[PDB]
Amino acid sequence: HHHHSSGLVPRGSHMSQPSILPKPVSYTVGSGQFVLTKNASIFVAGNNVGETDELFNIGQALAKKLNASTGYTISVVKSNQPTAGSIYLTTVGGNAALGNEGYDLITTSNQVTLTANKPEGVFRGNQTLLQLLPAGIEKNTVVSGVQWVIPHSNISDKPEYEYRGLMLDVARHFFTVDEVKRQIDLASQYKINKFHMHLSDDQGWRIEIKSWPDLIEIGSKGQVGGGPGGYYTQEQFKDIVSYAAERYIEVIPEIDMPGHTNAALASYGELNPDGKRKAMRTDTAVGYSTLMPRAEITYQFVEDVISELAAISPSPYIHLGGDESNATSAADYDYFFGRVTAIANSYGKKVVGWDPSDTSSGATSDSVLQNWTCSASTGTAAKAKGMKVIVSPANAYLDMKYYSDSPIGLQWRGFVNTNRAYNWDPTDCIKGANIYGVESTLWTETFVTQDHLDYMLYPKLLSNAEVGWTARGDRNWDDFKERLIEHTPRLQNKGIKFFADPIV
Numbered sequence: 304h305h306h307h308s309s310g311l312v313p314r315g316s317h318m319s320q321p322s323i324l325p326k327p328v329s330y331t332v333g334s335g336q337f338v339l340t341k342n343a344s345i346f347v348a349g350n351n352v353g354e355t356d357e358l359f360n361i362g363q364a365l366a367k368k369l370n371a372s373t374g375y376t377i378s379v380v381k382s383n384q385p386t387a388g389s390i391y392l393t394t395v396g397g398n399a400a401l402g403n404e405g406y407d408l409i410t411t412s413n414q415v416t417l418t419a420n421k422p423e424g425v426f427r428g429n430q431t432l433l434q435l436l437p438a439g440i441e442k443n444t445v446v447s448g449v450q451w452v453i454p455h456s457n458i459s460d461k462p463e464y465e466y467r468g469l470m471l472d473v474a475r476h477f478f479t480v481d482e483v484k485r486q487i488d489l490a491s492q493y494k495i496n497k498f499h500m501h502l503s504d505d506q507g508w509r510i511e512i513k514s515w516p517d518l519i520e521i522g523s524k525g526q527v528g529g530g531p532g533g534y535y536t537q538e539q540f541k542d543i544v545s546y547a548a549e550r551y552i553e554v555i556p557e558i559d560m561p562g563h564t565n566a567a568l569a570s571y572g573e574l575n576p577d578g579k580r581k582a583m584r585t586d587t588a589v590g591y592s593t594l595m596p597r598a599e600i601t602y603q604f605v606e607d608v609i610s611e612l613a614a615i616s617p618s619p620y621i622h623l624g625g626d627e628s629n630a631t632s633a634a635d636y637d638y639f640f641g642r643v644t645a646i647a648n649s650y651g652k653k654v655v656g657w658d659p660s661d662t663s664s665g666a667t668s669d670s671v672l673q674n675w676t677c678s679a680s681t682g683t684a685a686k687a688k689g690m691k692v693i694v695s696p697a698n699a700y701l702d703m704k705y706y707s708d709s710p711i712g713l714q715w716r717g718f719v720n721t722n723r724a725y726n727w728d729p730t731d732c733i734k735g736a737n738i739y740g741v742e743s744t745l746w747t748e749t750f751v752t753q754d755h756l757d758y759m760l761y762p763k764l765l766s767n768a769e770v771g772w773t774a775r776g777d778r779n780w781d782d783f784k785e786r787l788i789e790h791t792p793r794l795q796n797k798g799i800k801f802f803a804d805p806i807v
């Protein structure tokens with residue numbers, strides 16, 4: 304047999320017809336169609352009144368999206384007796400083999416029925432439902448001249464990996480609550496279910512800590528390149544968490560330590576050996592900063608930060624970073640990371656950390672390794688200790704330029720086009736591990752505007768999202784590429800300022 308790899312498309316990027324991404328476990332189409340009309344209602348029914356109430360909220364979220372593009376005023380009804388023309392969302396009789404996020408979605412001429420095990424699965428299935436309707440449905444303003452049809456179809460679906468995440472770096476350049484919510488919303492439509500906020504680094508500190516107010520008064524006042532920076536109040540952070548929770552997205556906050564800490568060191572002189580505040584940094588160097596690993600004030604500082612963050616962050620996880628502590632000795636790093644893990648655990652939080660944090664003698668089997676290095680030796684400790692692993696290989700470093708000539712992005716992991724972001728498997732990064740899942744990391748050294756974020760995340764994130772959701776056996780670039788071409792108008796309709804990748 305004859306095989307080939309993909310080159311660029313001749314004559315430039317290519318960038319009744321559903322466009323499901325990520326690819327579902329099964330999808331068949333039959334004769335006939337459902338028509339969504341102005342008289343449609345969404346019916347919801349759970350196994351008890353509390354569950355029905357939860358489904359009702361999910362239903363209203365779906366109605367909101369449908370109403371924006373159709374111009375209808377679809378409303379939601381608590382009833383298990385849907386009427387012809389209805390969408391019906393239910394958890395009664397879900398197929399347990401599909402798990403928490405799985406669902407069946409069967410569209411007949413008279414009715415759309417989404418059957419899941421849990422409300423979470425209904426929400427994930429609704430993302431598929433939106434992709435079954437015609438291009439135009441994802442507009443934020445009313446679209447005329449499009450019949451709102453869904454082909455008779457049968458879908459069953461569940462994720463391959465439990466953790467399918469996006470990290471946004473808000474330290475290097477700041478992004479507003481509105482901007483963050485928008486990225487969470489867009490990502491949720493592709494079944495991303497985790498959002499990791501990199502809230503602190505050398506160039507900025509972005510979360511209000513009431514006990515150490517100069518982290519904001521001093522530490523938040525800049526960013527890479529000398530812009531004004533910004534921060535989230537604790538109320539704003541709670542609002543982001545709430546918005547994510549409505550999309551069944553867990554928010555994992557990161558306070559990077561003991562490295563990547565210049566903003567803290569610039570805020571409080573007492574965190575430095577000489578007692579003086581560091582000058583703020585607006586460059587892009589990494590690796591040079593460190594907390595004092597053998598001073599108790601360091602651990603008081605960390606405890607205060609963790610106490611306040613834990614109080615406002617419902618995720619069972621806090622990310623304590625641990626990357627590039629090049630001004631910290633191996634012995635001091637081992638000791639430091641063990642100490643801060645104990646602090647986090649005492650406040651009821653399990654610790655996530657970048658490699659080599661798994662090597663700390665103070666880690667537990669409940670700690671999680673975020674494996675970004677993806678070398679043969681990375682995560683040897685994690686594996687031995689039974690720690691879950693989240694992979695972030697080169698193919699998930701979405702801040703990498705698509706090509707040599709990309710106008711934004713870095714390139715220390717090489718270029719990452721839409722094909723490279725697709726053509727990998729989590730087992731490529733690490734062998735013999737309990738792989739919890741994948742996280743796409745959007746570092747922001749070179750991204751200043753919302754348009755920059757859109758350009759680098761789309762279509763790259765779509766590739767990563769499919770790697771997280773769709774089983775390896777059913778992933779195929781030639782297939783995905785053609786599906787992505789078909790999906791393009793939907794990106795445009797959403798107002799995403801995507802890159803029209805010439806490999807698509």
Ligand SMILES: CC(=O)N[C@H]1/C(=N/OC(=O)Nc2ccccc2)O[C@H](CO)[C@H](O)[C@@H]1O
Binds near residue numbers: 589627700715
């Ligand atoms: C865990 C992690 O990602 N840490 C930092 C970095 N780590 O980047 C490098 O180590 N770069 C590098 C390595 C060798 C040669 C030249 C650059 O990459 C990112 C940009 O992609 C951000 O700067 C992160 O703060």
